[PDB]
Amino acid sequence: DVPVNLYRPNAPFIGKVISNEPLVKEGGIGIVQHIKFDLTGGNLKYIEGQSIGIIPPGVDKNGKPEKLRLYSIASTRHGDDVDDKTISLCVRQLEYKHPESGETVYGVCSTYLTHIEPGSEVKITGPVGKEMLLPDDPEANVIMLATGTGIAPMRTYLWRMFKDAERAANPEYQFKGFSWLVFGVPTTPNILYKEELEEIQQKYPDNFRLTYAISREQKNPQGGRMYIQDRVAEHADELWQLIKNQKTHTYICGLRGMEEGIDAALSAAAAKEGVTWSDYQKDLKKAGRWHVETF
Numbered sequence: 001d002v003p004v005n006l007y008r009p010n011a012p013f014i015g016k017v018i019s020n021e022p023l024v025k026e027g028g029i030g031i032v033q034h035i036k037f038d039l040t041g042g043n044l045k046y047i048e049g050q051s052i053g054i055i056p057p058g059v060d061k062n063g064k065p066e067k068l069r070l071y072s073i074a075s076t077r078h079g080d081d082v083d084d085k086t087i088s089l090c091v092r093q094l095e096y097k098h099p100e101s102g103e104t105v106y107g108v109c110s111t112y113l114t115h116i117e118p119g120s121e122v123k124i125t126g127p128v129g130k131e132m133l134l135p136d137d138p139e140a141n142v143i144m145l146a147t148g149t150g151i152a153p154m155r156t157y158l159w160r161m162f163k164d165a166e167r168a169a170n171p172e173y174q175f176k177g178f179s180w181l182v183f184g185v186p187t188t189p190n191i192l193y194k195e196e197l198e199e200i201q202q203k204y205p206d207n208f209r210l211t212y213a214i215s216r217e218q219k220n221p222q223g224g225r226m227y228i229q230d231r232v233a234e235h236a237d238e239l240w241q242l243i244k245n246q247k248t249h250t251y252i253c254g255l256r257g258m259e260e261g262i263d264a265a266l267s268a269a270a271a272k273e274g275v276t277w278s279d280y281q282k283d284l285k286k287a288g289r290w291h292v293e294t295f
């Protein structure tokens with residue numbers, strides 16, 4: 001049912017870049033690009049919450065061909081133009097410290113992607129993943145906890161739930177539950193898809209709540225920079241109350257590091273009702289209602 005591995009690294013799909021557009025506004029930190037690829041001429045199909053591989057050109061330091069890197073799909077199954085002809089990624093250029101030979105170091109696949117020109121051919125594999133899938137139940141509640149490019153699967157969910165053209169294209173999924181995105185980035189310019197996310201909340205105030213953790217602009221009650229775990233702590237009781245619903249699904253995506261604080265917050269909330277969160281969570285995971293993709 002769920003499409004997987006329609007293309008594999010040994011014979012990847014050769015897609016063409018359609019567009020490569022910046023998502024970080026001026027005054028933001030780093031580079032994050034929205035890259036749309038043409039799928040025509042191949043049979044790559046995918047659904048929300050899946051990933052694809054990109055095989056960058058060139059050899060590694062040892063002279064071996066570069067292997068694929070996985071990227072969360074950022075578009076619904078229909079693509080950004082709701083035409084079933086494209087796929088989009090949300091790619092941060094990896095950039096880091098002196099402590100790794102030279103000065104600034106640039107990630108191979110992410111630099112390739114963020115600097116790629118429209119018209120260029122790209123080697124695409126996949127799709128991959130069954131752990132971040134959205135329920136077909138239109139009355140499900142969906143909690144989304146994202147940092148940085150972790151927004152990508154959330155965008156696929158929210159566009160499917162809330163975009164006019166998606167609703168028109170998906171007769172069987174007219175979302176009427178409650179979705180809550182807690183999104184952590186360093187700056188307001190770094191709020192990926194800010195305008196569209198805010199448009200959704202304005203349009204669907206009873207079906208979508210948008211919460212930001214903006215680390216360079218907000219402080220947690222301890223005086224530290226605000227991160228998503230601080231927002232989870234702040235709204236722990238409400239989040240736990242929602243999680244108790246048989247139809248609630250939670251999705252976590254982004255760089256590793258926040259799950260521990262998220263667990264501590266939810267544990268304190270659940271303990272008030274004599275529930276051990278770690279146990280409840282194990283059962284949620286088994287039932288397919290606790291979805292984590294951290295990298």
Ligand SMILES: Cc1cc2nc3c(=O)[nH]c(=O)nc-3n(C[C@H](O)[C@H](O)[C@H](O)COP(=O)(O)OP(=O)(O)OC[C@H]3O[C@@H](n4cnc5c(N)ncnc54)[C@H](O)[C@@H]3O)c2cc1C
Nearest residue numbers: 069070071072090091092094096107108109110149152295
């Ligand atoms: C399921 C999944 C989904 C993903 N989705 C996305 C996505 O949507 N968007 C996105 O941008 N990325 C995503 N990634 C990460 C992506 O796959 C790549 O790992 C990332 O883009 C960097 O790859 P690269 O080739 O540019 O860097 P590489 O050239 O492969 O370098 C990576 C290496 O650099 C070193 N390194 C990395 N960070 C540091 C640091 N801070 N300090 C010191 N050394 C460091 C580590 O040794 C690491 O092995 C996802 C990963 C997975 C597994």
